[PDB]
Amino acid sequence: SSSNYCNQMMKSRNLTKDRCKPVNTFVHESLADVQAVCSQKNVACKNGQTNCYQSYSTMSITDCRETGSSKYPNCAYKTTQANKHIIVACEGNPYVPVHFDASV
């Protein structure tokens, strides 16, 4: 693992300590603003469920993707920064995000 944001955060958040996760997205917004998405635009999820919601606005996100040579225990990631709408699946009470369906 290098020193880029992805290699470090994937490790710190317990994603690559015992495996190399192929892809992962980190959202750079307040927790409350992401939870607010559960009452925004209702859309179908990839699996066909209707408990997904798309954010009205784009959000700051960092995409982390394993390079072609990455191999446990030396996971390596390519970091890509972008601003896009997020789609999360929500459940429970309070109605909060439990899955990241995608980013547009």
Binding site: M9, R13, N14, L15, N24, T25, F26, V27, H28, E29, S30, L31, V34, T62, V88, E91, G92, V96, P97, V98, H99, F100
Partner: peptide, 15 residues
């Protein structure tokens, strides 16, 4: 242990 909501925060949020 860790709820689905908490897992989502740990894996995807960086405020």
């Amino acid at each position: 242990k860790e709820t689905a909501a908490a897992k989502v925060e740990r894996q995807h949020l960086d405020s």
